[PDB]
Short mmCIF file of C-alpha atoms and ligand atoms in Angstrom, two decimals:
data_model
loop_
_atom_site.label_atom_id
_atom_site.label_comp_id
_atom_site.label_asym_id
_atom_site.label_seq_id
_atom_site.Cartn_x
_atom_site.Cartn_y
_atom_site.Cartn_z
CA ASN A 1 23.05 15.89 32.51
CA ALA A 2 19.88 14.94 34.41
CA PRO A 3 17.07 12.42 33.72
CA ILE A 4 14.16 13.15 31.38
CA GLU A 5 10.73 13.14 32.99
CA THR A 6 7.53 11.84 31.44
CA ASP A 7 4.58 9.81 32.65
CA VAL A 8 4.51 7.23 29.86
CA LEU A 9 7.48 6.04 27.82
CA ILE A 10 6.38 4.33 24.64
CA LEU A 11 8.78 1.81 23.17
CA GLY A 12 8.09 1.23 19.48
CA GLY A 13 7.12 3.80 16.89
CA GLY A 14 4.83 1.66 14.79
CA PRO A 15 1.08 2.26 14.28
CA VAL A 16 0.24 1.02 17.80
CA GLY A 17 2.90 3.05 19.59
CA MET A 18 1.68 6.12 17.71
CA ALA A 19 -1.95 5.38 18.53
CA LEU A 20 -1.19 5.18 22.24
CA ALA A 21 0.70 8.46 21.75
CA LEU A 22 -2.20 10.16 20.00
CA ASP A 23 -4.78 9.05 22.59
CA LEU A 24 -2.53 9.92 25.52
CA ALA A 25 -1.94 13.27 23.85
CA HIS A 26 -5.70 13.81 23.77
CA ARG A 27 -5.96 12.91 27.45
CA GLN A 28 -3.24 15.44 28.21
CA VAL A 29 -0.75 12.82 29.45
CA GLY A 30 2.93 13.57 28.92
CA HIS A 31 4.61 10.83 26.92
CA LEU A 32 7.66 10.23 24.77
CA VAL A 33 8.10 7.75 21.92
CA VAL A 34 11.43 6.13 21.12
CA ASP A 35 11.83 4.14 17.91
CA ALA A 36 15.26 2.71 17.12
CA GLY A 37 14.41 3.80 13.58
CA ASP A 38 16.10 0.58 12.48
CA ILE A 39 10.41 -5.51 11.57
CA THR A 40 10.06 -8.49 9.18
CA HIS A 41 6.25 -8.72 9.15
CA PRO A 42 3.25 -9.03 6.79
CA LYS A 43 2.47 -5.91 4.76
CA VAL A 44 -0.74 -4.59 6.33
CA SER A 45 -2.54 -1.82 4.43
CA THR A 46 -6.11 -1.96 5.69
CA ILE A 47 -7.42 -0.02 8.68
CA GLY A 48 -10.67 -1.41 10.04
CA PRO A 49 -13.75 0.79 10.59
CA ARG A 50 -13.21 0.62 14.35
CA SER A 51 -9.65 1.90 14.08
CA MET A 52 -10.89 4.59 11.72
CA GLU A 53 -13.32 5.67 14.43
CA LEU A 54 -10.44 5.97 16.90
CA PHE A 55 -8.46 8.08 14.41
CA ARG A 56 -11.59 10.19 13.96
CA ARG A 57 -11.44 10.92 17.71
CA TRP A 58 -7.80 11.92 17.30
CA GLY A 59 -8.37 14.12 14.27
CA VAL A 60 -6.32 12.17 11.75
CA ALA A 61 -8.95 10.12 9.95
CA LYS A 62 -9.16 12.64 7.09
CA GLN A 63 -5.40 12.73 6.64
CA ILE A 64 -5.48 8.94 6.32
CA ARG A 65 -8.19 8.96 3.67
CA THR A 66 -6.45 11.60 1.60
CA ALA A 67 -3.01 10.12 2.22
CA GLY A 68 -2.67 8.77 -1.31
CA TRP A 69 -4.80 5.68 -1.85
CA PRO A 70 -6.50 6.36 -5.19
CA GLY A 71 -10.26 6.82 -4.89
CA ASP A 72 -11.16 5.21 -8.20
CA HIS A 73 -9.24 2.00 -7.52
CA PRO A 74 -11.23 -1.22 -6.84
CA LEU A 75 -11.49 -2.69 -3.36
CA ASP A 76 -12.58 -6.08 -4.72
CA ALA A 77 -11.10 -9.32 -3.40
CA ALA A 78 -10.63 -11.68 -6.36
CA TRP A 79 -9.84 -15.40 -6.43
CA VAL A 80 -7.93 -16.39 -9.57
CA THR A 81 -5.67 -18.93 -11.27
CA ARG A 82 -3.31 -16.10 -12.14
CA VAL A 83 -3.50 -12.34 -12.11
CA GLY A 84 -4.58 -12.16 -15.74
CA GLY A 85 -5.70 -15.75 -15.95
CA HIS A 86 -9.17 -17.12 -15.32
CA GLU A 87 -11.18 -15.42 -12.59
CA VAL A 88 -12.93 -17.83 -10.23
CA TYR A 89 -14.77 -15.90 -7.52
CA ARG A 90 -15.01 -12.20 -6.72
CA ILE A 91 -16.40 -9.91 -4.02
CA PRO A 92 -17.25 -6.49 -5.44
CA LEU A 93 -16.44 -3.90 -2.81
CA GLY A 94 -16.60 -0.75 -4.92
CA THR A 95 -14.04 2.02 -4.79
CA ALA A 96 -13.05 4.42 -2.03
CA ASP A 97 -15.06 7.22 -3.64
CA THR A 98 -18.28 5.62 -4.92
CA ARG A 99 -19.60 3.07 -2.40
CA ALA A 100 -22.46 2.63 0.07
CA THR A 101 -21.83 4.85 3.10
CA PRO A 102 -21.93 2.33 6.05
CA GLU A 103 -24.89 2.40 8.44
CA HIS A 104 -23.28 0.99 11.60
CA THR A 105 -20.23 3.26 11.42
CA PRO A 106 -19.41 6.86 10.42
CA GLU A 107 -15.91 5.77 9.34
CA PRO A 108 -15.61 2.89 6.90
CA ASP A 109 -12.36 0.94 6.74
CA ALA A 110 -9.51 2.62 4.86
CA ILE A 111 -6.36 1.87 2.87
CA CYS A 112 -3.05 3.40 3.90
CA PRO A 113 0.22 1.46 3.55
CA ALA A 114 3.09 2.10 5.98
CA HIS A 115 5.02 4.44 3.66
CA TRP A 116 2.12 6.82 4.11
CA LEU A 117 0.75 6.00 7.55
CA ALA A 118 4.15 6.40 9.25
CA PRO A 119 4.78 10.03 8.20
CA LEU A 120 1.15 10.80 9.05
CA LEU A 121 1.22 9.42 12.54
CA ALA A 122 4.61 11.03 13.03
CA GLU A 123 3.45 14.55 12.29
CA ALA A 124 0.23 14.18 14.27
CA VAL A 125 2.37 13.11 17.21
CA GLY A 126 5.02 15.80 16.72
CA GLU A 127 8.14 16.48 18.83
CA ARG A 128 7.27 13.83 21.39
CA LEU A 129 8.45 11.20 18.90
CA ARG A 130 12.16 10.58 19.22
CA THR A 131 13.05 8.73 16.03
CA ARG A 132 16.39 7.02 15.57
CA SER A 133 16.51 6.51 19.35
CA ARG A 134 17.42 3.19 20.94
CA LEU A 135 16.53 1.88 24.38
CA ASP A 136 19.80 0.67 25.93
CA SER A 137 18.03 -0.77 28.95
CA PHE A 138 15.37 -0.24 31.57
CA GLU A 139 15.33 -0.77 35.31
CA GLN A 140 12.05 -0.83 37.22
CA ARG A 141 11.87 1.15 40.48
CA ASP A 142 9.14 1.29 43.12
CA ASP A 143 7.09 4.23 41.83
CA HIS A 144 8.67 4.61 38.39
CA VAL A 145 10.80 3.12 35.62
CA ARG A 146 14.26 4.16 34.48
CA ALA A 147 15.50 3.59 30.97
CA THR A 148 18.46 4.74 28.93
CA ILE A 149 18.01 5.99 25.38
CA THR A 150 20.86 6.54 22.94
CA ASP A 151 20.25 9.31 20.42
CA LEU A 152 21.39 7.34 17.35
CA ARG A 153 21.81 10.68 15.59
CA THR A 154 24.19 12.34 18.06
CA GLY A 155 25.32 9.25 19.97
CA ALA A 156 24.52 10.81 23.34
CA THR A 157 22.80 8.57 25.85
CA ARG A 158 20.09 9.87 28.19
CA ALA A 159 18.27 8.49 31.24
CA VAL A 160 14.48 8.65 31.35
CA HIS A 161 12.20 8.76 34.42
CA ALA A 162 8.66 7.48 33.87
CA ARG A 163 5.61 6.46 35.89
CA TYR A 164 4.93 3.69 33.35
CA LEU A 165 6.63 2.06 30.37
CA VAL A 166 4.68 0.62 27.45
CA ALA A 167 6.35 -1.58 24.87
CA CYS A 168 5.17 -2.08 21.29
CA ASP A 169 8.46 -3.59 20.17
CA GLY A 170 6.74 -6.06 17.88
CA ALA A 171 6.09 -9.74 18.04
CA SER A 172 9.66 -10.41 18.92
CA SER A 173 9.50 -8.07 21.87
CA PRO A 174 12.70 -7.95 23.76
CA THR A 175 10.82 -6.30 26.64
CA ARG A 176 8.57 -9.33 26.95
CA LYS A 177 11.54 -11.68 26.80
CA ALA A 178 13.25 -9.48 29.39
CA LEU A 179 10.23 -9.51 31.70
CA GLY A 180 10.27 -13.28 31.42
CA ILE A 181 6.76 -13.42 30.00
CA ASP A 182 6.03 -16.23 27.57
CA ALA A 183 3.75 -16.41 24.54
CA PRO A 184 3.29 -20.05 23.44
CA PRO A 185 1.85 -20.61 19.90
CA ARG A 186 -1.93 -21.04 19.77
CA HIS A 187 -1.50 -22.50 16.28
CA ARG A 188 1.23 -23.75 13.93
CA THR A 189 3.90 -21.37 12.67
CA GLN A 190 4.13 -21.09 8.90
CA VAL A 191 6.69 -19.36 6.71
CA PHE A 192 6.01 -16.97 3.83
CA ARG A 193 7.97 -14.63 1.56
CA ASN A 194 6.88 -11.03 0.85
CA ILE A 195 7.91 -10.14 -2.66
CA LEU A 196 7.53 -6.41 -3.15
CA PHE A 197 7.58 -5.54 -6.83
CA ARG A 198 6.59 -2.70 -9.12
CA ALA A 199 4.43 -3.10 -12.23
CA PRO A 200 3.87 0.37 -13.80
CA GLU A 201 1.25 -0.93 -16.22
CA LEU A 202 -0.21 -3.92 -14.38
CA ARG A 203 -3.28 -1.88 -13.50
CA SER A 204 -3.85 -0.58 -17.03
CA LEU A 205 -3.64 -4.12 -18.40
CA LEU A 206 -6.09 -5.46 -15.82
CA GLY A 207 -8.44 -2.53 -16.17
CA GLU A 208 -11.92 -3.10 -14.77
CA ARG A 209 -10.61 -6.50 -13.60
CA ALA A 210 -8.30 -4.91 -11.01
CA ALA A 211 -8.58 -5.68 -7.31
CA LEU A 212 -7.28 -4.55 -3.95
CA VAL A 213 -6.18 -8.17 -3.56
CA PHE A 214 -5.92 -11.37 -5.59
CA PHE A 215 -6.03 -14.80 -3.98
CA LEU A 216 -3.96 -17.16 -6.09
CA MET A 217 -4.98 -20.75 -6.80
CA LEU A 218 -1.91 -21.71 -8.82
CA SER A 219 -0.01 -24.05 -6.47
CA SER A 220 0.64 -25.07 -2.88
CA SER A 221 3.09 -22.19 -2.64
CA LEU A 222 1.19 -19.83 -4.93
CA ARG A 223 -2.26 -19.88 -3.38
CA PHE A 224 -1.88 -16.66 -1.45
CA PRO A 225 -2.75 -12.97 -1.92
CA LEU A 226 -1.20 -10.52 -4.34
CA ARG A 227 -2.13 -7.05 -3.12
CA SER A 228 -2.18 -3.60 -4.72
CA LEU A 229 -0.37 -1.60 -2.03
CA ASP A 230 -0.75 1.92 -3.35
CA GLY A 231 -2.82 1.18 -6.44
CA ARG A 232 -0.14 3.12 -8.30
CA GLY A 233 2.29 0.40 -9.30
CA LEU A 234 3.42 -1.08 -5.99
CA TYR A 235 2.45 -4.69 -5.26
CA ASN A 236 3.19 -7.43 -2.74
CA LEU A 237 3.15 -11.14 -3.53
CA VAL A 238 2.87 -13.63 -0.70
CA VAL A 239 4.26 -17.06 -1.34
CA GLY A 240 4.21 -20.15 0.82
CA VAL A 241 7.54 -21.63 1.83
CA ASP A 242 7.44 -25.33 2.60
CA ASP A 243 9.67 -26.04 5.64
CA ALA A 244 12.59 -26.09 3.13
CA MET A 245 11.59 -20.70 -7.06
CA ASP A 246 13.19 -17.30 -7.64
CA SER A 247 11.79 -13.86 -6.88
CA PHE A 248 11.35 -12.64 -10.45
CA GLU A 249 10.33 -16.14 -11.55
CA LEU A 250 7.58 -16.35 -8.95
CA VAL A 251 6.12 -12.91 -9.65
CA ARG A 252 6.12 -13.74 -13.34
CA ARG A 253 4.34 -16.95 -12.38
CA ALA A 254 1.58 -15.09 -10.53
CA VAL A 255 1.07 -12.54 -13.32
CA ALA A 256 -0.11 -13.74 -16.74
CA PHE A 257 1.02 -10.54 -18.42
CA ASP A 258 4.25 -9.83 -20.25
CA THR A 259 4.76 -6.39 -18.70
CA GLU A 260 7.65 -4.65 -16.93
CA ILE A 261 8.28 -6.10 -13.49
CA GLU A 262 10.76 -4.82 -10.91
CA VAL A 263 11.26 -6.78 -7.69
CA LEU A 264 12.16 -4.37 -4.84
CA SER A 265 12.33 -6.73 -1.87
CA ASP A 266 11.82 -10.39 -1.10
CA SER A 267 11.88 -11.36 2.58
CA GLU A 268 10.75 -14.06 5.00
CA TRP A 269 8.24 -13.55 7.79
CA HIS A 270 6.81 -16.10 10.19
CA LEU A 271 3.04 -16.18 10.58
CA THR A 272 2.50 -16.74 14.30
CA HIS A 273 -0.37 -17.10 16.77
CA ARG A 274 0.95 -15.92 20.11
CA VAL A 275 -0.73 -14.22 23.05
CA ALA A 276 1.43 -13.27 26.01
CA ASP A 277 0.65 -14.99 29.31
CA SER A 278 0.72 -11.53 30.87
CA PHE A 279 0.16 -8.03 29.57
CA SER A 280 2.20 -6.37 32.30
CA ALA A 281 4.82 -6.79 34.98
CA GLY A 282 4.34 -4.02 37.52
CA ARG A 283 4.95 -0.69 35.80
CA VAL A 284 5.83 -2.12 32.40
CA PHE A 285 3.08 -2.94 29.92
CA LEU A 286 2.83 -4.64 26.53
CA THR A 287 0.66 -3.71 23.52
CA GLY A 288 0.12 -4.70 19.91
CA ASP A 289 2.24 -7.60 18.72
CA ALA A 290 4.25 -7.67 21.95
CA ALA A 291 1.07 -8.82 23.68
CA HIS A 292 -0.93 -10.49 20.93
CA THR A 293 0.15 -11.57 17.43
CA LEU A 294 -2.34 -13.09 14.97
CA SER A 295 -2.67 -14.20 11.35
CA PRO A 296 -3.11 -11.22 9.00
CA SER A 297 -6.13 -12.97 7.43
CA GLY A 298 -8.84 -10.41 8.10
CA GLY A 299 -6.58 -7.50 9.00
CA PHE A 300 -7.51 -8.02 12.67
CA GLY A 301 -3.91 -7.62 13.77
CA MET A 302 -3.41 -3.87 13.76
CA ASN A 303 -6.98 -3.17 14.79
CA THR A 304 -6.60 -5.30 17.88
CA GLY A 305 -3.40 -3.53 18.80
CA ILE A 306 -4.87 -0.08 18.26
CA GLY A 307 -7.95 -1.25 20.10
CA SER A 308 -5.74 -2.37 23.00
CA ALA A 309 -3.61 0.79 23.08
CA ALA A 310 -6.77 2.87 23.42
CA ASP A 311 -7.95 0.69 26.31
CA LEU A 312 -4.60 1.09 28.04
CA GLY A 313 -4.70 4.76 27.12
CA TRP A 314 -7.55 5.89 29.30
CA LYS A 315 -6.60 3.49 32.11
CA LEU A 316 -3.11 4.89 32.29
CA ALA A 317 -4.36 8.49 32.37
CA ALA A 318 -6.99 7.69 35.01
CA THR A 319 -4.37 6.18 37.31
CA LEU A 320 -2.17 9.19 36.52
CA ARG A 321 -4.87 11.75 37.30
CA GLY A 322 -5.38 9.63 40.40
CA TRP A 323 -9.08 8.89 40.06
CA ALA A 324 -8.95 5.26 38.93
CA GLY A 325 -9.16 2.54 41.54
CA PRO A 326 -5.85 0.78 42.26
CA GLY A 327 -7.30 -2.20 40.38
CA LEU A 328 -8.12 -0.50 37.06
CA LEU A 329 -4.81 -1.14 35.30
CA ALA A 330 -5.30 -4.85 35.89
CA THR A 331 -8.43 -4.59 33.73
CA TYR A 332 -6.35 -3.91 30.61
CA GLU A 333 -5.42 -7.58 30.48
CA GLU A 334 -8.75 -8.72 31.90
CA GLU A 335 -10.61 -7.14 28.99
CA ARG A 336 -8.09 -7.00 26.17
CA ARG A 337 -6.63 -10.49 26.39
CA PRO A 338 -9.94 -12.28 25.72
CA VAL A 339 -10.51 -10.01 22.72
CA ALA A 340 -7.06 -10.68 21.35
CA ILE A 341 -7.72 -14.40 21.66
CA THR A 342 -11.13 -14.20 20.05
CA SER A 343 -9.73 -12.17 17.15
CA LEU A 344 -6.82 -14.61 16.99
CA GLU A 345 -9.11 -17.59 16.49
CA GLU A 346 -11.25 -15.92 13.84
CA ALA A 347 -8.14 -14.81 11.98
CA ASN A 348 -7.13 -18.46 12.14
CA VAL A 349 -10.50 -19.56 10.76
CA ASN A 350 -9.78 -17.39 7.70
CA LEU A 351 -6.26 -18.76 7.34
CA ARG A 352 -7.50 -22.34 7.58
CA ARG A 353 -10.13 -21.66 4.95
CA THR A 354 -7.34 -20.89 2.46
CA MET A 355 -5.02 -23.74 3.47
CA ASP A 356 -7.67 -26.49 3.37
CA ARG A 357 -9.22 -25.39 0.05
CA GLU A 358 -7.51 -28.06 -2.11
CA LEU A 359 -6.85 -26.98 -5.73
CA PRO A 360 -8.45 -28.92 -8.69
CA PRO A 361 -6.66 -30.77 -11.56
CA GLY A 362 -7.60 -28.76 -14.63
CA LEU A 363 -8.30 -25.54 -12.79
CA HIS A 364 -6.25 -23.27 -15.04
CA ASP A 365 -7.64 -25.37 -17.90
CA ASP A 366 -8.86 -23.31 -20.87
CA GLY A 367 -12.29 -23.51 -22.48
CA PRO A 368 -15.29 -25.21 -20.85
CA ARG A 369 -14.11 -28.49 -19.12
CA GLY A 370 -12.17 -25.87 -17.25
CA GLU A 371 -14.79 -23.14 -17.15
CA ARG A 372 -16.96 -25.77 -15.49
CA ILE A 373 -14.34 -26.96 -13.02
CA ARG A 374 -13.68 -23.34 -12.00
CA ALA A 375 -17.43 -22.73 -11.77
CA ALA A 376 -17.56 -25.64 -9.34
CA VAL A 377 -14.98 -24.02 -7.06
CA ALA A 378 -16.55 -20.57 -7.24
CA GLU A 379 -19.49 -22.22 -5.49
CA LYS A 380 -17.77 -24.43 -2.93
CA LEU A 381 -15.59 -21.39 -2.17
CA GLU A 382 -18.67 -19.29 -1.47
CA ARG A 383 -20.09 -22.25 0.45
CA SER A 384 -16.91 -22.27 2.54
CA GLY A 385 -17.77 -18.66 3.32
CA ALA A 386 -14.93 -16.71 1.73
CA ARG A 387 -16.68 -13.35 2.17
CA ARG A 388 -16.25 -13.69 5.97
CA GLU A 389 -12.63 -12.66 5.53
CA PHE A 390 -13.65 -9.27 4.14
CA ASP A 391 -17.04 -8.63 5.74
CA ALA A 392 -16.46 -9.19 9.44
CA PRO A 393 -18.47 -6.50 11.30
CA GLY A 394 -18.58 -8.79 14.33
CA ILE A 395 -14.82 -8.76 14.79
CA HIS A 396 -14.48 -5.03 14.19
CA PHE A 397 -17.31 -3.93 16.43
CA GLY A 398 -18.58 -7.02 18.26
CA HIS A 399 -16.44 -7.41 21.37
CA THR A 400 -18.15 -7.25 24.73
CA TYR A 401 -16.09 -6.98 27.87
CA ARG A 402 -17.10 -9.29 30.71
CA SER A 403 -15.16 -7.80 33.61
CA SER A 404 -14.95 -6.65 37.21
CA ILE A 405 -15.89 -3.16 36.06
CA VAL A 406 -18.88 -3.67 33.77
CA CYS A 407 -22.17 -4.51 35.50
CA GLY A 408 -22.90 -7.16 32.89
CA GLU A 409 -26.30 -8.46 31.83
CA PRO A 410 -26.56 -12.28 31.89
CA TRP A 411 -24.22 -8.78 13.54
CA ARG A 412 -26.34 -6.13 15.20
CA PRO A 413 -25.20 -3.07 17.23
CA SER A 414 -25.96 -3.22 20.95
CA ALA A 415 -25.66 -0.78 23.86
CA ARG A 416 -25.24 -3.84 26.04
CA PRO A 417 -22.76 -3.39 28.93
CA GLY A 418 -19.17 -4.10 27.96
CA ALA A 419 -20.04 -3.44 24.33
CA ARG A 420 -19.20 -0.47 22.11
CA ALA A 421 -21.89 2.24 22.24
CA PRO A 422 -23.59 2.14 18.79
CA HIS A 423 -23.38 4.68 16.03
CA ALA A 424 -26.28 7.02 15.32
CA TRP A 425 -26.54 10.50 13.90
CA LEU A 426 -27.47 13.24 16.34
CA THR A 427 -27.02 15.66 13.46
CA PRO A 428 -25.80 15.07 9.91
CA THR A 429 -22.32 16.00 11.17
CA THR A 430 -22.08 14.71 14.71
CA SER A 431 -22.34 11.00 15.52
CA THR A 432 -23.03 9.71 19.01
CA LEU A 433 -19.54 8.26 18.84
CA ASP A 434 -18.22 11.81 18.90
CA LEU A 435 -19.26 12.27 22.53
CA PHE A 436 -17.16 9.38 23.81
CA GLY A 437 -13.40 9.45 24.19
CA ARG A 438 -12.80 11.82 27.12
CA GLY A 439 -14.21 10.87 30.52
CA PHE A 440 -17.39 8.96 31.48
CA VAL A 441 -20.49 10.00 29.60
CA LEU A 442 -24.04 9.53 30.81
CA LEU A 443 -26.79 9.31 28.21
CA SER A 444 -30.46 9.87 29.00
CA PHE A 445 -33.54 9.71 26.83
CA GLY A 446 -36.37 12.03 27.77
CA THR A 447 -36.00 12.09 31.56
CA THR A 448 -33.35 14.02 33.49
CA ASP A 449 -34.23 12.81 36.98
CA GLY A 450 -31.43 11.36 39.07
CA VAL A 451 -28.75 12.96 36.92
CA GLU A 452 -27.92 15.65 39.47
CA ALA A 453 -27.32 12.61 41.68
CA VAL A 454 -24.73 10.82 39.54
CA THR A 455 -23.17 14.14 38.57
CA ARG A 456 -22.35 14.48 42.26
CA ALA A 457 -21.30 10.88 42.95
CA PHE A 458 -18.74 11.09 40.15
CA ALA A 459 -17.80 14.55 41.36
CA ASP A 460 -17.29 13.00 44.82
CA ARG A 461 -14.48 10.87 43.42
CA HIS A 462 -13.19 13.42 40.89
CA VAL A 463 -14.16 10.95 38.19
CA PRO A 464 -14.56 13.12 35.10
CA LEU A 465 -18.09 12.89 33.71
CA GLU A 466 -20.26 14.54 31.08
CA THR A 467 -24.03 14.16 30.89
CA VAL A 468 -25.99 14.44 27.67
CA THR A 469 -29.74 14.44 27.19
CA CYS A 470 -30.91 13.12 23.92
CA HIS A 471 -34.35 12.99 22.49
CA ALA A 472 -35.07 11.45 19.13
CA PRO A 473 -36.41 7.94 19.65
CA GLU A 474 -34.55 6.00 17.01
CA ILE A 475 -31.40 6.42 19.12
CA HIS A 476 -33.40 5.92 22.32
CA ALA A 477 -34.64 2.70 20.75
CA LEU A 478 -31.23 1.55 19.52
CA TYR A 479 -29.78 2.00 23.02
CA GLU A 480 -32.88 0.48 24.67
CA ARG A 481 -32.55 1.68 28.29
CA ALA A 482 -33.35 5.20 29.44
CA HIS A 483 -29.93 5.75 31.02
CA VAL A 484 -26.75 4.47 29.37
CA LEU A 485 -23.29 5.02 30.86
CA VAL A 486 -20.28 5.01 28.52
CA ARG A 487 -16.62 4.69 29.57
CA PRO A 488 -13.82 6.91 28.20
CA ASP A 489 -13.21 4.25 25.56
CA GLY A 490 -16.78 4.27 24.27
CA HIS A 491 -17.92 0.93 25.66
CA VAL A 492 -21.08 0.62 27.72
CA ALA A 493 -20.45 0.31 31.45
CA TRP A 494 -24.03 0.22 32.66
CA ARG A 495 -27.59 0.87 31.55
CA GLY A 496 -31.13 0.81 32.87
CA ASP A 497 -34.33 2.84 33.01
CA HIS A 498 -33.52 3.81 36.61
CA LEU A 499 -30.24 4.76 38.33
CA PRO A 500 -29.41 2.38 41.23
CA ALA A 501 -29.48 3.70 44.83
CA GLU A 502 -25.91 3.75 46.14
CA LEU A 503 -24.07 5.43 43.27
CA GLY A 504 -20.78 5.34 45.16
CA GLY A 505 -20.79 1.58 44.85
CA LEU A 506 -21.22 2.14 41.12
CA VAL A 507 -18.65 4.87 40.49
CA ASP A 508 -16.17 2.81 42.52
CA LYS A 509 -16.91 -0.29 40.46
CA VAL A 510 -16.41 1.33 37.05
CA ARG A 511 -13.26 3.23 37.97
CA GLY A 512 -11.94 -0.10 39.22
CA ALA A 513 -11.79 0.64 42.95
CA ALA A 514 -14.42 -1.58 44.55
O1 LIG B 601 -0.30 -11.14 4.05
C1 LIG B 601 -1.39 -10.47 4.17
N1 LIG B 601 -1.43 -9.13 4.28
C2 LIG B 601 -2.82 -8.65 4.42
C3 LIG B 601 -2.88 -7.94 5.74
O2 LIG B 601 -2.25 -6.89 5.82
O3 LIG B 601 -3.53 -8.40 6.71
C4 LIG B 601 -3.60 -9.90 4.36
C5 LIG B 601 -2.76 -11.01 4.22
C6 LIG B 601 -3.27 -12.43 4.13
C7 LIG B 601 -2.75 -13.79 4.00
C8 LIG B 601 -1.43 -14.26 3.89
C9 LIG B 601 -1.22 -15.66 3.77
C10 LIG B 601 -2.33 -16.55 3.76
C11 LIG B 601 -3.66 -16.06 3.87
C12 LIG B 601 -3.88 -14.66 3.99
N2 LIG B 601 -5.02 -13.88 4.12
C13 LIG B 601 -4.65 -12.57 4.20
C14 LIG B 601 -5.50 -11.45 4.36
N3 LIG B 601 -6.86 -11.49 4.44
C15 LIG B 601 -7.30 -10.20 4.59
C16 LIG B 601 -8.58 -9.63 4.73
C17 LIG B 601 -8.72 -8.23 4.87
C18 LIG B 601 -7.57 -7.39 4.87
C19 LIG B 601 -6.28 -7.95 4.72
C20 LIG B 601 -6.16 -9.36 4.59
C21 LIG B 601 -5.03 -10.14 4.44
#
């Protein structure tokens, strides 16, 4: 009959669309997610420690850890000639259960394939997720956007009113194409096949030699990962496709065992390096793949999209509540593009590592001449810095925003402006991270002078703000300055042992007004 009314219309029900939905939900912003219900892309099971911190904010981290990934399954990354052949190099990474509890984060990375993450994110989001719904089209108006969604379950079509429209329609984003925004390739496009197969006993056979992922060194086409998706029988084999040999043949090539193998799917997927020239066109925005696609080498892809959705999340709400400066939305691209590009390059440095590593003559050679050749590689491989692909704390946490709303100061955790406020335990159950996520938060160590001042400045502009006084010195040390200001996203916006005189000039700068 009449149009639907919501502030933010999310296009794309994948992890990123859901993340934006969860954060917006926690900021009390009315939204609606439409997913055609009907994405040829890498497989993607890992969730970085930074994304796990965001899900902690949203109360779903636990559900993700108990989703189904077995706790006694290895997390090792192993380089081999074949899965069951000679092992060349290995990075022990323990199991989910028994492993060193991280010191720089309260939430270590996690495993949760799509056939588990999807239902999770769906329930956490609830009714505001309209599955099996297709966007017919969208027209942009002066103060809002108008779309048309067809309920693919009933056939009915419905018009939707919305202050803003955010698209997460993947790397092929129609919305981006429609907005006439381009995303030229930052690096060469390669082709790969994702062979999903089931090996009921593959794990039993391997035993202690199992691994979250196996890097193959068997051929030009078979020198790519073989991952345990659910550590319960499901596996994915990546194989390189020259520019242009059978599914079951290949899998049987990768695995040295004579055990039951059932191929479930075998599909192509382009590996691309594309960052959109723009992240928005007026009232329509772009997140995740639609704005920045990278190589899955390092799992930076999804974390950068979830990291971007969260940034757009509090900037959308702020403009909606009316307290952000008219220039704050513009900062989404100003801060998130450079991160996407930095993560893109590093992902590429991991991809290159694998492509350039030429494979020796008698590598899969048995007995010593071979044991020695393989030993050789195990060293050059480590010399090439393989571990970087799995231990990259600088990509997960190390991203400092240099922008018009961070009073900048001209790996190891820093409370440096534009950076993510470091982790520290205030109590064995509450991390400092747990204070960030709502509105601005002012931290003070020892002193409390000048706080009544800021409290009012922010209050002058309705800018939500919380002030916390902390005491232990370890944290005070870690954060350095006496007064640290954290944005709704948990990144430092300013710090110093003394609050500057005209606070209005400050509040206005951080909210993106002046
Ligand atoms: O397809 C993938 N799927 C994996 C993914 O989902 O990113 C993946 C994939 C590939 C991958 C695929 C082709 C060539 C090199 C590659 N490195 C990787 C990866 N390196 C990682 C490090 C940590 C976590 C995941 C990966 C990874």
